[PDB]
Design a protein around this ligand. Structure first.
Ligand SMILES: Nc1ncnc2c1ncn2[C@@H]1O[C@H](COP(=O)(O)OP(=O)(O)O)[C@@H](O)[C@H]1O
Ligand SMILES: Nc1ncnc2c1ncn2[C@@H]1O[C@H](COP(=O)(O)OP(=O)(O)O)[C@@H](O)[C@H]1O
Ligand SMILES: Nc1ncnc2c1ncn2[C@@H]1O[C@H](COP(=O)(O)OP(=O)(O)O)[C@@H](O)[C@H]1O
Ligand SMILES: [Mg+2]
Ligand SMILES: [Mg+2]
Ligand SMILES: [Mg+2]
Lengths: 517, 517, 517
């Protein structure tokens, strides 16, 4: 034929209008979750599985979006979550709003070219305004670092114990943190989250070490060790074999017994190499023969087999131990330390706690909660609580919350609009207006008077200053700095980046050609 | 069941959303025809019938609207066309736009109550402002009446001879106009339109009488009468019969003859009663026997039968003759005068022209054109032309064209908003901004830069005063007064009532319940 | 079979549960139209037809309820509209509400019997409490009568002219009103409503006579009579025939004429009989032969044929004329007087106005307006306005509005519940509570804080007194008496009566058996 049937195409206004609509819809879908008063969503996938969350990234990810432009709105939250860790909603909402105001200009007949260029200037000029107004704080200031973490947790469900969770999140990042070049660098992978139902979120805590979901491989081995000298062996503690094909040919009765002992020996020899280093705790990545388990047990050594590669590494980093491939070359220096290593039946489940390490470079947070739901949402809160603390240590720059930065950006970006002037100024004025959905949908979700509320806030801000924003807990504008309600200078900078990029990306597509969706 | 199935329903956001959207769609369908540059639409009905026009009223009507809120938009053009006769498109567009700016306020969470109240104040205050700025003129000032007529014809197809047509229109309304109470009063029904194909719109002329589409009932009757004495008879010129059932019983041969003669006599006795008044031209509403015809012929009288009651009434006002029910009581005080009455074969189509009438109180405008479409559209042009000339003679007030009044209204109404303040001020301010679609879409249909051109006009007007509007032929702002381009103060006053009412009616519906559409 | 398949049946819990649901659903549908701030609904019948209203009665009637318990809710509005004309929404709401609280008591396992008996006691005590607190007024006090009417018109669309319309209604009812037994008695059938599109609701006038949609039958007759002596003839002015079959047998030529003349004569003598009374205006219920028209024209008499039987009686009551079956007995004492009877062409349509009547016992209200919808709704407003004025003149007792009565009934009916005690007390308490949906949905439709508002109002009322209610225009509690916002003591009495009976009726159905719906 001439072109695949069932393949639709849209051009000009059509393409743009739809893409913008799609994006806007998806955006309004998540805006009901913005801020402390935000509502939750219930996602029921095709396999009955139920996900109840406040998290934008999860919602957009779990929801089966079909329209292309709406799938692009997912990337926005994806990039946000991966760069600043928080403000995923903020970015998606601003992206849709930007796209709405952008259409107003299109209807008005302004060339897409002009709108794009104006958004760029408004965007670039926006970063500038933020870097400048950013309250530069001390990279490791316990004080402000606790606030950043708590303000992040006060946006989701588990805000009932923002106290504890913030403490743990700040604590856990300071521990695994790294600063040998002047400024900090935080590899968050060095923080494992352990979730176990039962108890209360009150029982959640920081394990300065690692928690592994395995058990002691043999009955006779110790279930607890005081000052453990841990050995990390990534080798199969079993009867080795030659690469070259080989088979034993018993020719006389006494051979049956000799060969078995030959292997017992081999097995007992490897275990000896491990006992000699003075190790009383061994984590093996591969398997462990039964006989090897026997000798290991006699020496009063605690061993666990089939340890997850990712677990091995966290043990190495938390105990100071060294992973080895050959037991023969194992030395006491390869061993690591843990003030206590014990198997505990937490919720009828057997887990091993490698706690009380010297100075772990990897640490674990144990999350406790009444239901799977309570837990999964607390973990989601901590991951943001942690990702933001990480941003402040590497950045040493914070901003007030409650739309305060967007209000400032709006007011300011409008002046800039004037000096730019022309068609461009229209785009720059619209872009600056768009930034208001944050303060807007913030008081909205809180059940306040949008229209009226936004007028007092743009007033106070113009009067009192940059620290003025909306306080959904106050129902009135307030100095967010005085209330410690702040957020990473990176969260805003990345939201603005992602949003405008998306907005502009769509504003540039003048034709859509799809086949089956 | 509970509520009939196949019955849909919407509430709140849903209802309004869908109603506003439906209205807007309709509005934007006709907006491409606004102004002199506007475009025509081709409408093909279910029966293959073709209609090409620029008229909103015709379009909204021929197009089969299905959605409820969209049919209510047809009511707006209907009200307008039966009150000011012009600006049907204008009323609709301002209505849709008035709704669009209204949804923006709903989204902002403003109670529909507040918006309606605000739109009411704006609409009320606008009649007031129009009344004020209105340029009072002389009820019969031949001058401004010729402009108003041509400014109207210009905005349509026919603007190619706005000269001739605007003349025929001002001339024809002055002739049939009435005024015995101090002020004029025009009954447009007294102006008949005669459409006939062939020639050019150039041959279109005013007939100070009436054109009728009938023939001279008999071959030997006069095809022309100089100073005609006209008789208007609404009685059948045929052998009357008794209400009481009756039948003749011929009993002897001589009776066949004797009876036929008794009828001839009855027939002739009537033709006599007519000839004796001096009437040389007879118009009969009912039928005419063949003998009654032969007599009228022999007396040199010209007769026409089966004349439309509506045509009889027009001849009554045009020749000053009186309609009579009984020929026996026909006095010559009942005859009428027409300078010439003749049967012309206009396009192979025989017709009777009754021209040269004394002071006709009813007249006829004959239209000529190449195609059926040319004529129909010329007729439509003349109807608005006549209808406007009527508003001025009755109203004695005009306004500048090109969206000048709406621009003045926009500007002033905003100030009013300021002084009214509150949430309503937002409704009022929006209403004011809404009015800008006329200049906006006027320039747009012209091919001008909307955004830019609209800044120029709001400027000039803001400086050079009320007469400044946009001129699609000039492609820039001008003083509409100096250009002579104007419209009736009624056209704008009605467009506002019509549109604002429609808008408020829709804004009030919070629930739609339909069974099959 | 045993019982037709497709015959659903419900019992006890089920039956009552569903009935109460269907009842409440209907109730909630209309409660959004309660009060001055209420919304309108758009009704689209399967044939396309569009109806936009605020009138509960029209909505319940237009919608196609299918459920039995829902249809019963239409009867509530019907009875309300026929006993007090206003408060149709109020009764349907308090009914569904009563059913809601009633089920609460059913779930508590209280026997339907008890709920029914407690509701009857609450209902009974209600009237009593209403008669007592009712503010007795002077049956014809022009003041309170003008309020009642405006207070009523304010609760619908056309409140933009609560002023004009209220006047027209108090006036129209004071006229046609009758009272010879001491107290008043109004027959609203003597108030015809005439609706014609065009103009504004401003030109609405009270024709102290009758407007008829017919025209002067003959051309040569007067289209206007100064001091009319009117004849109401219910007889056909045409050649009478015998009951006994008959037919004329013409035998000689001279007969064709002698017979026609004999009929002309018959006809003429009928007209002579009418002329001899001095009558210049004739209204004939039946036909009017052609000749009969001609003779009537010569005498300079204005005649209209085919007048509606309903119209004839209005003419008889307005002009004082007496309908006559036989022209032969028409005497001058049968004629009636009208200061002016003229054929005016209102809204392009010919009509006959009979105004300036002596002391009309029947009067017409002419309604003007832009669209058909503005018209129909104004009429609905007026019918309620007329009907409330009627209640006060007959009752001579009023009450404050904005829920003031219901608040008083709630507060009071509770103490009554105390003295009754037992399960009954629970039914009585719930009944007293249900009555709050009025103040409740009144503030709710306005957009006020339902919960908080309903507490300020019960407080004030407990303090200031019976006149304390909600003023949707004030957004706060107010003394409705000092405000002039009042309603007929009958409307409230009838609401309780209606609702409680409807409720008790359903509370009594323990089994439902249906075949197809
Ligand atoms: N106490 C508060 N009052 C008003 N706004 C707050 C408060 N705390 C946080 N916010 C705001 O809420 C937003 C974060 O809400 P959230 O639901 O977590 O979505 P997101 O994915 O964008 O972080 C931020 O813009 C922040 O400024
Ligand atoms: N020469 C002109 N220049 C600018 N505007 C004009 C001119 N002539 C008419 N208009 C405007 O165009 C509109 C009338 O256009 P038209 O297509 O006839 O639609 P409508 O049904 O509203 O009369 C009016 O608002 C009028 O002011
Ligand atoms: N100004 C007002 N303020 C508060 N309530 C009012 C006002 N005017 C009327 N009402 C109330 O609104 C109700 C009438 O509203 P309406 O929409 O006409 O419905 P209904 O069919 O019950 O008359 C009455 O109960 C009355 O007390
Ligand atoms: Mg967050
Ligand atoms: Mg026009
Ligand atoms: Mg009412």
């Amino acid at each position: 034929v001439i072109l695949p049937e069932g393949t639709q195409r849209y051009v000009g206004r059509d393409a743009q209008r739809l893409n913008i609509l799609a994006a806007r819809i998806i955006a309004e879908t998540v805006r009901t979750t913005l801020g402390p008063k935000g509502m939750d969503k219930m996602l029921v996938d095709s396999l009955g599985d139920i996900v109840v969350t406040n998290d934008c990234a999860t919602i957009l990810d779990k929801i089966d979006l079909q329209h292309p432009a709406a799938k692009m709105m997912v990337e926005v939250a994806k990039t946000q979550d991966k760069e600043a860790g928080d403000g995923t909603t903020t970015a998606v909402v601003i992206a849709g709003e930007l796209l709405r105001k952008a259409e107003e200009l299109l209807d008005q007949n302004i060339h897409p070219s002009i709108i794009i260029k104006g958004y760029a200037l408004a965007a670039e000029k926006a970063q500038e305004i933020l870097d400048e107004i950013a309250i530069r704080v001390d990279p490791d200031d316990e004080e402000t670092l606790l606030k950043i973490a708590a303000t992040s947790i006060t946006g989701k469900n588990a805000e009932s114990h923002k106290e504890l969770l913030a403490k743990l999140a700040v604590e856990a990042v300071k521990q695994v943190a790294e600063k040998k070049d002047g400024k900090y660098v935080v590899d968050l992978d060095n923080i494992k989250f352990e979730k176990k139902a039962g108890e209360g979120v009150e029982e959640s805590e920081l394990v300065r070490g690692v928690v592994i979901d395995k058990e002691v491989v043999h009955p006779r081995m110790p279930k607890r060790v005081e000052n453990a000298k841990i050995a990390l062996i990534n080798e199969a503690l079993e009867v080795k074999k030659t690469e070259t094909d080989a088979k034993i040919n018993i020719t006389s009765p006494d051979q049956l017994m000799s060969f078995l002992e030959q292997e017992e020996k081999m097995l007992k020899d490897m275990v000896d190499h491990i006992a000699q280093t003075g190790a009383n705790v061994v984590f093996v990545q591969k398997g462990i023969d039964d006989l090897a388990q026997h000798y290991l047990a006699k020496y009063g050594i605690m061993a666990v087999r089939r340890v997850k590669k990712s677990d091995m590494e966290k043990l190495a980093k938390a105990t100071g131990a060294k992973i080895v491939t050959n037991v023969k070359d194992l030395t006491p220096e390869d061993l690591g330390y843990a003030e206590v290593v014990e198997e505990r039946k937490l919720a009828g489940e057997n887990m091993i706690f490698v706690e009380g390490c010297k100075n772990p470079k990897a640490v674990t947070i144990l999350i406790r909660g009444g239901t799977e739901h309570v837990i999964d949402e607390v973990e989601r809160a901590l991951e943001d609580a942690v990702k933001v603390v990480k941003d402040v240590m590497e950045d040493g720059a914070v901003l007030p919350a409650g739309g305060a930065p967007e209000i400032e950006l709006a007011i300011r970006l409008d002046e800039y609009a004037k000096q730019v002037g022309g068609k461009e100024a229209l785009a720059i004025e619209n872009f600056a207006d768009a930034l208001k959905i944050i303060p807007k949908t913030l008081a909205e979700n809180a059940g306040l008077d949008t229209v009226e509320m936004l007028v007092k806030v743009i007033s106070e801000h113009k009067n009192r200053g940059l620290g003025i924003g909306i306080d959904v807990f106050e129902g009135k504008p307030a100095d967010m700095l005085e209330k410690g309600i702040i957020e990473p200078l990176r969260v805003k900078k990345q939201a603005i980046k992602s949003a405008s990029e998306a907005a502009i990306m769509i504003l540039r597509i003048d034709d859509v050609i799809a086949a089956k969706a």
